[PDB]
Write a protein that holds these residues in place. Structure first.
Motif, mmCIF file in Angstrom:
data_model
loop_
_atom_site.group_PDB
_atom_site.id
_atom_site.type_symbol
_atom_site.label_atom_id
_atom_site.label_comp_id
_atom_site.label_asym_id
_atom_site.label_seq_id
_atom_site.Cartn_x
_atom_site.Cartn_y
_atom_site.Cartn_z
ATOM 1 N N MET B 17 0.798 -1.218 0.000
ATOM 2 C CA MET B 17 0.000 0.000 0.000
ATOM 3 C C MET B 17 0.834 1.274 0.000
ATOM 4 O O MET B 17 0.267 2.363 -0.141
ATOM 5 C CB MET B 17 -0.925 0.015 1.217
ATOM 6 C CG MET B 17 -2.240 0.728 0.989
ATOM 7 S SD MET B 17 -3.413 -0.254 0.046
ATOM 8 C CE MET B 17 -4.916 0.682 0.316
ATOM 9 N N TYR B 141 -0.573 3.803 3.694
ATOM 10 C CA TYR B 141 -1.218 4.726 2.786
ATOM 11 C C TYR B 141 -0.844 6.165 3.121
ATOM 12 O O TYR B 141 -0.405 6.901 2.251
ATOM 13 C CB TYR B 141 -2.717 4.551 2.862
ATOM 14 C CG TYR B 141 -3.472 5.394 1.881
ATOM 15 C CD1 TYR B 141 -3.607 6.759 2.072
ATOM 16 C CD2 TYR B 141 -4.058 4.826 0.765
ATOM 17 C CE1 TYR B 141 -4.301 7.533 1.173
ATOM 18 C CE2 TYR B 141 -4.757 5.594 -0.138
ATOM 19 C CZ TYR B 141 -4.870 6.945 0.075
ATOM 20 O OH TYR B 141 -5.562 7.720 -0.807
ATOM 21 N N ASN B 218 -12.463 8.010 -7.449
ATOM 22 C CA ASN B 218 -11.951 7.700 -8.774
ATOM 23 C C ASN B 218 -11.829 8.942 -9.640
ATOM 24 O O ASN B 218 -10.875 9.065 -10.409
ATOM 25 C CB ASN B 218 -12.881 6.697 -9.454
ATOM 26 C CG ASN B 218 -12.487 6.407 -10.889
ATOM 27 O OD1 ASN B 218 -13.333 6.392 -11.781
ATOM 28 N ND2 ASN B 218 -11.203 6.170 -11.121
HETATM 29 O O1 LIG Z 1 -4.467 8.967 -3.407
HETATM 30 C C1 LIG Z 1 -3.793 8.062 -3.044
HETATM 31 N N1 LIG Z 1 -2.586 8.166 -2.281
HETATM 32 C C2 LIG Z 1 -2.076 6.803 -2.048
HETATM 33 C C3 LIG Z 1 -0.938 6.328 -1.368
HETATM 34 C C4 LIG Z 1 -0.689 4.954 -1.299
HETATM 35 C C5 LIG Z 1 -1.579 4.046 -1.910
HETATM 36 C C6 LIG Z 1 -2.709 4.517 -2.586
HETATM 37 C C7 LIG Z 1 -2.961 5.898 -2.657
HETATM 38 N N2 LIG Z 1 -4.048 6.674 -3.283
HETATM 39 C C8 LIG Z 1 -5.163 6.115 -4.027
HETATM 40 C C9 LIG Z 1 -6.468 6.873 -3.789
HETATM 41 C C10 LIG Z 1 -6.882 7.753 -4.977
HETATM 42 N N3 LIG Z 1 -6.957 7.070 -5.979
HETATM 43 C C11 LIG Z 1 -8.276 6.775 -6.336
HETATM 44 C C12 LIG Z 1 -8.377 5.811 -7.520
HETATM 45 C C13 LIG Z 1 -7.035 5.465 -8.016
HETATM 46 N N4 LIG Z 1 -7.135 4.686 -9.250
HETATM 47 C C14 LIG Z 1 -8.292 4.391 -10.050
HETATM 48 O O2 LIG Z 1 -9.406 4.729 -9.847
HETATM 49 N N5 LIG Z 1 -7.871 3.598 -11.164
HETATM 50 C C15 LIG Z 1 -6.417 3.394 -11.057
HETATM 51 C C16 LIG Z 1 -5.502 2.702 -11.869
HETATM 52 C C17 LIG Z 1 -4.151 2.668 -11.524
HETATM 53 CL CL1 LIG Z 1 -2.988 1.791 -12.550
HETATM 54 C C18 LIG Z 1 -3.703 3.327 -10.365
HETATM 55 C C19 LIG Z 1 -4.612 4.012 -9.559
HETATM 56 C C20 LIG Z 1 -5.975 4.050 -9.903
HETATM 57 C C21 LIG Z 1 -6.226 6.673 -8.261
HETATM 58 C C22 LIG Z 1 -6.243 7.605 -7.054
#
Ligand code: A1IVJ
Ligand code: NAG
Lengths: 127, 380
Positions: B17, B141, B218
């Protein structure tokens, strides 16, 4: 019927740049797509780029992404396609087509567009 | 005893994560690294994650239990590696859809992570070790989000190197996934409770709130990139994300501490927090200032965390340990069905195809309607 007119294509040297223009006419275009398709000899009609004149959204085909750039000159209705770094594979005939912006429109499908222009060649020659 | 299958699993949950590149996803994609437009990202690439996740949810749920968890965790590690390899090197829209599908596979496999500990830990270390496994991932995270912004603003690293770091993190996360012990047993196959009506009410609220929150998360970063494009302005996505996660964590703890008869106050608190989430989304939409957009996000995430913690407490207070897996699987499946329907109708190029600037008006209206539906039957 909506009249479309491409203009600004011709010979260009391989690797160099050119700008095409599709002077749409005959109606209001505040709710219109405007996309460019091409047809090289022996191939099928291919998608090149698109612009949503309402929201300004722009779509590109992966074969031209980054190299081409499409923009709308609103004050004149003349949509433009700016081709940078044309390569030998870009030899084609370029058409500009339009479709009324409506529900469930497939932007990249050549059968979606109701109106087509007469086309204008872009002979991307290489010495 | 319960140590080794808990240290190994928590190290996996941490390193998997900790992905510093996630906050700057949109700025990475739409910049000179990939040249993808905002319209393409928002209306052709991102919707694929919902569809692949919906398709892969149930088959993965059954496979995990038949295969006893660890192999599904290994699959999740492999999917992390593949997704980030494509995200680094893959180019064009045609590859980003595959990236989204593999990430949907990654998310669906999260079931085999949280449920694995139950199969190998005694029942006298279940209650607490669940907390360790949740907290380790949450801390990872927040740490990743803070590190992203620290690096971007005090070191001047391009968004490509954040992805390189994230790949290096998930690779080590996978390594610790080979070392878990294979559970000798499982819940159902190697070992209709909704008949209760109140559980159904709480599950409906949980599913609807989860769908709305998963959609907003998203499509939030695209709103920030349109209100303050990264090409010519300072972007603070990492710090805002870290603070939002920390606020959510504090909200979750606070709900856990404060003692109140939720059989009377649960509905009122859920309505109030739904209204807060709708108002905050409207504030995040209308205002042109970027800082107000960040503040609206922060309030949204905190209120959603309070709401979801209350809803989870109410559902799980009567269910056995065995029924948790199935009940929450069905609840997340309904959530994904709802999310897929709304994504198809609103965002997909085969539907309305709305841009990000107007999507959040719909999402705010959706949360307000969620709040307002439960309040009826007021005279007679
Ligand atoms: O915003 C963050 N900061 C984080 C730090 C560590 C781990 C996760 C974190 N996030 C995720 C939350 C926001 N997050 C929401 C959805 C995420 N997301 C999609 O909807 N489709 C995706 C496809 C790939 Cl290949 C990567 C990310 C994807 C992108 C940002
Ligand atoms: C993206 O577009 C820019 C435009 O100048 C170009 O220089 C760059 O090489 C392109 N990169 C990719 C990976 O397409």
């Amino acid at each position: 019927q909506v009249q479309l007119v491409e203009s600004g294509g011709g010979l260009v040297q391989a690797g160099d740049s050119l700008r095409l223009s599709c002077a749409a006419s005959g109606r209001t275009f505040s709710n219109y797509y405007m996309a460019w398709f091409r047809q090289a000899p022996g191939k099928e009609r291919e998608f090149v780029a698109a612009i949503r004149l309402s929201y300004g959204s722009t779509y590109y085909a992966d074969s031209v992404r980054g190299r081409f750039t499409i923009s709308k000159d609103n004050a004149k209705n003349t949509v433009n396609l700016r081709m940078n770094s044309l390569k030998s594979e870009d030899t084609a005939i370029y058409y500009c087509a339009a479709a009324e912006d409506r529900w469930a429109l497939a932007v990249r499908t050549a059968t979606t567009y109701n109106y087509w222009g007469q086309g204008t060649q872009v002979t991307v020659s290489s010495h | 005893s319960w140590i080794y299958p808990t240290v190994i699993l928590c190290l996996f949950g941490f390193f998997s994560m900790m992905r510093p590149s996630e906050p700057f996803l949109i700025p990475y994609l739409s910049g000179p690294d990939k040249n993808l437009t905002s319209a393409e990202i928002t209306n052709e690439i991102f919707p694929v994650w919902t569809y692949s996740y919906l398709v892969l949810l149930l088959p993965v749920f059954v496979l995990t239990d038949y295969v006893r968890y660890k192999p599904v965790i290994i699959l999740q590690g492999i999917s992390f590696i593949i997704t980030w390899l494509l995200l680094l090197f893959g180019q064009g829209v045609k590859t980003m859809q595959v990236v989204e599908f593999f990430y949907g596979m990654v998310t669906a496999a999260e079931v085999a992570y949280y449920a694995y500990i139950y199969s190998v830990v005694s029942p006298e270390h279940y209650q607490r070790v669940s907390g360790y496994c949740r907290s380790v991932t949450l801390a990872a995270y927040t740490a990743g989000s803070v590190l992203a912004q620290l690096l971007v603003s005090l070191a001047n690293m391009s968004y490509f190197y954040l992805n390189v770091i994230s790949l290096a993190s998930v690779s080590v996360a996978f390594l610790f996934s080979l070392f878990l012990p294979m559970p000798k047993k499982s819940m159902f196959f190697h070992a209709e409770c909704y008949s209760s009506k109140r559980l159904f009410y709480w599950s409906l609220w949980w599913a609807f709130a989860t769908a709305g929150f998963n959609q907003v998360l998203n499509y939030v970063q695209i709103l920030w990139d349109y209100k303050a494009p990264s090409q010519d302005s300072s972007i603070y996505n990492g710090a805002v994300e870290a603070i939002a996660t920390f606020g959510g964590a504090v909200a979750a703890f606070a709900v856990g501490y404060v003692k109140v008869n939720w059989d009377l106050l649960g509905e009122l608190a859920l309505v109030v927090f739904s209204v807060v989430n709708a108002g905050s989304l409207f504030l995040m939409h209308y205002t042109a200032n970027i800082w107000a957009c960040y503040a609206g996000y922060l309030i949204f995430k905190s209120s959603y965390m309070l709401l979801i913690t209350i809803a989870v407490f109410q559902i799980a207070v009567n269910l056995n340990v065995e029924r948790y897996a199935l009940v929450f699987g069905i609840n997340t499946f309904i959530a994904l069905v709802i999310q897929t329907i709304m994504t198809v109708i609103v965002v997909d190029q085969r539907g309305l195809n709305l841009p990000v600037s107007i999507q959040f008006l719909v999402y705010g209206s959706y949360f307000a309607v969620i709040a307002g539906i439960f309040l009826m039957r007021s005279m007679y």
